[PDB]
Amino acid sequence: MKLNVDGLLVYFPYDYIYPEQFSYMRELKRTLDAKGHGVLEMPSGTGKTVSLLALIMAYQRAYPLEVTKLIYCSRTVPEIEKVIEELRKLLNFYEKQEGEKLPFLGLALSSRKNLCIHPEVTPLRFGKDVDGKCHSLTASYVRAQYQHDTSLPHCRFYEEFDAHGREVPLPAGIYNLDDLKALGRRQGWCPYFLARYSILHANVVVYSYHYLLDPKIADLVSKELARKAVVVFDEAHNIDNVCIDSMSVNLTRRTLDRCQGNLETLQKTVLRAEHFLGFLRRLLEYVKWRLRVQHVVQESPPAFLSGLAQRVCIQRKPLRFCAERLRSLLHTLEITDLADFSPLTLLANFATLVSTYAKGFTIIIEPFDDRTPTIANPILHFSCMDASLAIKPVFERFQSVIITSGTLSPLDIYPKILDFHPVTMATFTMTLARVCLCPMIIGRGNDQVAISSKFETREDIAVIRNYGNLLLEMSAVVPDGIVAFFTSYQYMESTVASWYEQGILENIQRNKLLFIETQDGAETSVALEKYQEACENGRGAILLSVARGKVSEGIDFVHHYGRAVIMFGVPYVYTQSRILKARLEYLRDQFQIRENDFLTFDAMRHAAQCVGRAIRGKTDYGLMVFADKRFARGDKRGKLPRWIQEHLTDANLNLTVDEGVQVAKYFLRQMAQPF
Amino acid sequence: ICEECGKEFMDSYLMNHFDLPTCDNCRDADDKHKLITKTEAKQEYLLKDCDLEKREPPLKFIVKKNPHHSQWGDMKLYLKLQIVKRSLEVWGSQEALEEAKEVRQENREKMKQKKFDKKVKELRRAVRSSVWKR
Amino acid sequence: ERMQILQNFKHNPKINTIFISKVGDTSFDLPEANVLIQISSHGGSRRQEAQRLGRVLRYNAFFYSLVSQDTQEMAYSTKRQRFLVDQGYSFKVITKLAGMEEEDLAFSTKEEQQQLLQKVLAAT
DNA sequence: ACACTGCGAGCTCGAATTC
DNA sequence: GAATTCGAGCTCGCAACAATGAGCACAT
Numbered sequence: 001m002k003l004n005v006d007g008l009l010v011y012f013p014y015d016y017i018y019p020e021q022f023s024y025m026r027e028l029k030r031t032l033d034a035k036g037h038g039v040l041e042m043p044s045g046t047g048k049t050v051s052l053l054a055l056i057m058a059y060q061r062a063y064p065l066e067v068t069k070l071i072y073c074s075r076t077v078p079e080i081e082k083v084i085e086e087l088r089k090l091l092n093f094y095e096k097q098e099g100e101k102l103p104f105l106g107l108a109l110s111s112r113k114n115l116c117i118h119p120e121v122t123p124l125r126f127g128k129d130v131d132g133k134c135h136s137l138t139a140s141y142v143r144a145q146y147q148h149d150t151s152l153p154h155c156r157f158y159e160e161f162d163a164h165g166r167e168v169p170l171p172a173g174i175y176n177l178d179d180l181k182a183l184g185r186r187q188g189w190c191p192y193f194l195a196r197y198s199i200l201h202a203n204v205v206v207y208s209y210h211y212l213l214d215p216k217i218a219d220l221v222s223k224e225l226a227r228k229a230v231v232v233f234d235e236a237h238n239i240d241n242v243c244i245d246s247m248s249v250n251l252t253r254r255t256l257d258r259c260q261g262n263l264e265t266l267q268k269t270v271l272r273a274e275h276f277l278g279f280l281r282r283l284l285e286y287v288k289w290r291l292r293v294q295h296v297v298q299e300s301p302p303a304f305l306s307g308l309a310q311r312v313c314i315q316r317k318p319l320r321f322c323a324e325r326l327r328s329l330l331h332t333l334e335i336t337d338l339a340d341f342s343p344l345t346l347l348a349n350f351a352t353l354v355s356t357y358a359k360g361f362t363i364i365i366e367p368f369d370d371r372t373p374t375i376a377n378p379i380l381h382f383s384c385m386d387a388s389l390a391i392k393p394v395f396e397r398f399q400s401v402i403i404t405s406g407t408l409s410p411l412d413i414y415p416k417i418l419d420f421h422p423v424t425m426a427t428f429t430m431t432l433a434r435v436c437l438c439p440m441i442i443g444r445g446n447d448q449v450a451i452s453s454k455f456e457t458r459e460d461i462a463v464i465r466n467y468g469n470l471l472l473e474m475s476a477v478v479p480d481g482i483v484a485f486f487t488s489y490q491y492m493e494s495t496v497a498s499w500y501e502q503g504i505l506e507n508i509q510r511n512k513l514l515f516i517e518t519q520d521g522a523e524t525s526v527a528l529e530k531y532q533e534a535c536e537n538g539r540g541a542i543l544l545s546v547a548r549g550k551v552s553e554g555i556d557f558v559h560h561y562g563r564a565v566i567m568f569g570v571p572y573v574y575t576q577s578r579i580l581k582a583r584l585e586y587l588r589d590q591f592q593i594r595e596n597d598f599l600t601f602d603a604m605r606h607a608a609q610c611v612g613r614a615i616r617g618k619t620d621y622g623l624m625v626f627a628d629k630r631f632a633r634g635d636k637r638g639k640l641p642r643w644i645q646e647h648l649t650d651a652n653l654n655l656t657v658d659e660g661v662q663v664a665k666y667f668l669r670q671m672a673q674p675f
Numbered sequence: 676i677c678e679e680c681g682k683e684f685m686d687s688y689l690m691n692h693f694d695l696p697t698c699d700n701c702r703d704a705d706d707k708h709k710l711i712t713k714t715e716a717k718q719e720y721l722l723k724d725c726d727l728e729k730r731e732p733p734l735k736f737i738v739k740k741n742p743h744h745s746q747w748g749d750m751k752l753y754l755k756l757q758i759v760k761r762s763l764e765v766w767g768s769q770e771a772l773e774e775a776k777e778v779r780q781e782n783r784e785k786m787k788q789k790k791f792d793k794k795v796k797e798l799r800r801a802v803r804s805s806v807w808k809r
Numbered sequence: 810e811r812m813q814i815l816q817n818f819k820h821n822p823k824i825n826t827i828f829i830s831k832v833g834d835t836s837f838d839l840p841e842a843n844v845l846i847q848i849s850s851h852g853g854s855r856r857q858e859a860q861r862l863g864r865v866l867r868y869n870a871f872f873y874s875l876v877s878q879d880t881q882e883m884a885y886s887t888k889r890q891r892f893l894v895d896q897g898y899s900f901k902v903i904t905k906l907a908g909m910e911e912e913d914l915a916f917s918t919k920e921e922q923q924q925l926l927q928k929v930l931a932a933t
Numbered sequence: 934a935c936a937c938t939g940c941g942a943g944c945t946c947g948a949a950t951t952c
Numbered sequence: 953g954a955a956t957t958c959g960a961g962c963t964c965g966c967a968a969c970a971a972t973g974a975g976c977a978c979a980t
């Protein structure tokens with residue numbers, strides 16, 4: 001299959017392509033020749049992954065001096081392994097079509113707990129534990145006596161790596177994480193340091209977000225890799241929530257009381273440098289003095305640094321090198337583990353963030369515990385407001401960076417928050433042989449009562465009955481699986497336990513089993529494996545869950561799991577938290593974003609992410625109701641993207657509960673029949 | 676570069692807001708221009724919704740907190756020099772503004788009297804029809 | 810409520826009739842009717858009774874045309890079949906229906922019929 | 934230093950017939 | 953030739969808008 005986009009000869013690994021998928025390769029080539037960014041919305045997960053890889057890998061053959069390396073930041077380790085398996089399928093197609101071999105290697109990067117051979121350290125569960133026991137065997141003072149080569153502890157694989165792993169590189173043959181461990185097994189090398197060494201000489205590199213947008217990581221691993229590359233941020237809805245949490249720390253009473261134990265253990269070891277311990281003891285009793293107050297919430301992002309020089313007299317010139325010398329002090333102290341000093345590194349990371357980064361930051365000290373009048377639980381948040389302060393290296397260092405997901409809801413918000421100027425900013429819609437989706441907005445109830453989940457319209461039983469009368473009448477006409485996302489956990493409890501006291505939850509269990517998705521991961525995976533079992537045998541099930549949850553982002557509901565997806569209200573965040581109430585005051589002055597146009601943007605990208613989870617494939621069909629009155633408004637249904645908005649007609653816009661069934665009952669009957 | 680005093684600077688009150696070519700040091704709150712609300716401009720200069728955002732070039736606005744709501748929404752603020760430059764551009768001259776304001780202020784006095792006239796025709800229709808039949 | 814009365818007519822097996830008035834004289838979205846009891850339309854519009862017929866063909870389906878005989882509507886209802894008999898359609902005449910007097914029909918007595926004339930003549 | 938979206942007024946037509 | 957009846961669509965003034973929750977991948 002020789003497929004010709006506007007100037008290039010793209011070798012596609014399939015036979016039939018979709019008519020919109022040609023324009024996705026056409027609009028992505030328009031970015032790469034212009035050497036600029038791009039915000040492309042493209043619905044599916046696969047197909048998008050194999051058409052983005054068919055173009056760029058074929059682009060670096062015809063213009064091998066303009067692009068050299070493709071970086072592919074995916075969300076987490078399951079989609080890291082999925083992209084590489086879509087690359088062998090493209091490489092082996094090129095192996096059959098051309099009959100030759102190539103100088104083409106593709107890697108995959110992850111943590112040390114995903115690339116590990118050493119048996120005494122690999123079953124360690126927590127990720128901060130495997131980083132310490134590796135460092136107990138790979139530190140430069142542990143190898144200092146290993147120049148003698150004694151029977152003193154070490155890593156067998158790491159000392160066998162740097163003696164033979166620099167002369168010869170990896171030849172070819174795209175590597176998964178399991179292939180790098182298998183190559184590390186039969187050769188005896190470390191997989192983690194082989195992948196990090198060979199990341200400088202590769203052509204496709206697939207890691208997570210945090211190697212590139214996390215500032216205390218990206219200068220160590222992705223520093224000198226490529227100046228003319230292509231970065232792809234796949235499934236990049238929450239870039240804003242990633243660049244905020246990477247530059248935001250959190251301090252409480254439990255953290256600072258553990259830092260006194262770290263300074264206690266540092267006092268016993270110096271007697272066995274002294275100005276730096278009195279430096280940290282000065283800083284620790286100030287932040288404890290600042291949490292000592294029981295007063296109103298207050299914010300002072302550079303004025304914290306002025307009052308830190310009054311009672312304590314510590315300036316910002318030694319405070320900038322606070323986290324540097326603490327990394328140097330533990331090196332000269334020759335300590336065994338470094339996970340035990342994790343509260344003190346968090347205080348050292350807090351000290352180097354107030355000193356340097358103060359333009360769009362805040363320090364929100366909240367002695368007032370949430371929802372309770374007087375309970376002694378203070379906490380100060382060092383919250384970042386500006387999501388463009390972690391991509392200013394990435395938008396500058398690389399040549400062209402593409403932000404692609406399936407549900408970028410307005411495309412003109414992402415270049416407003418993130419300070420950059422794209423060159424295409426395009427959207428697409430999937431082609432279909434049927435109507436593969438039937439979105440509806442089930443508004444008012446069966447007795448003409450409004451259904452919305454406001455804050456005043458939650459206690460009254462004229463709405464809780466109309467949610468129970470909806471899930472009852474959809475569980476009798478939908479086969480094999482209904483996913484019901486609620487807005488929170490305290491609203492899922494106060495509705496299910498108020499359906500049970502009425503005669504509504506008795507009649508839902510006659511039709512389908514119901515499996516509540518709880519917060520702890522042990523009960524959830526039990527209730528999820530029985531859900532996928534109940535959809536496969538006769539009964540069918542209802543997985544009622546929370547929209548800002550684990551199941552809403554991770555688990556993909558392929559066909560006959562979740563034929564319907566029911567949104568029980570607009571999934572807003574808590575719109576009166578003092579952190580969110582301060583970020584929106586930064587989004588009003590800077591970028592002139594309205595305060596109400598961001599709460600709905602944040603909600604219509606989490607209500608369109610979990611609804612868009614119901615359809616992944618060719619023959620997948622799926623109902624998707626929106627059970628709130630407020631979804632019908634123009635500033636809300638105009639947000640949700642163009643591939644679920646081009647089937648939302650004006651008839652399915654204020655359907656009542658009984659009228660929404662006969663749209664669903666006619667839709668599933670029509671889809672059940674062959675082509 | 677200011678366009679009134681010719682002083683060189685980085686930024687100021689305006690020219691990050693209303694695109695007005697002046698420095699902050701003239702400032703003349705009540706001697707060059709003031710902040711007017713979107714509702715005030717819309718009901719005072721008789722500007723529609725499709726003149727503050729689509730007549731080229733589009734003039735932008737400033738979002739602030741609604742003063743007597745404090746938790747509800749916003750309050751757009753346009754510039755009074757940008758409005759009187761736009762109202763003099765959309766509605767002929769200065770005098771053509773007010774002459775089309777007289778026909779609208781009598782129209783709301785026109786609807787006030789005819790709604791007290793259509794009720795006389797409607798309510799007496801039900802009482803005349805009972806007498807007219809036999 | 811034009812959009813939901815029309816949607817309660819199609820996807821609901823309970824609401825069965827609907828009383829339009831001069832709206833469906835074009836290519837609207839009237840959802841596949843099966844009978845059409847046309848009562849007292851415009852004067853001699855043979856365009857109209859070929860657009861009322863357009864709802865029916867969208868016996869299988871069959872539409873009626875109520876005429877008050879020995880009045881001016883008898884001359885009108887032959888002007889409007891003048892286009893449909895030139896296409897092949899045959900208009901039967903039902904002088905007496907199949908047992909109209911036996912069910913519970915309205916306006917049985919003359920007392921309830923005297924009140925309707927006083928409602929009509931009071932318009933003027 | 935207030936204010937989004939629906940929703941009825943005028944305005945001006947068309948179709949066919951009275952006046 | 954000049955009304956009516958009842959429909960149509962296009963402008964456009966008018967009145968008043970809103971926004972409530974909970975946790976593991978990634979560097980020495």
Ligand code: SF4
Pocket residue numbers: 112115116117118121133134138155157158190191192193
């Ligand atoms: S040095 Fe190699 S073998 Fe040792 S813990 Fe790290 S990755 Fe595992």
Ligand SMILES: [Zn+2]
Pocket residue numbers: 677678679680681682697698699700701
């Ligand atoms: Zn000046």
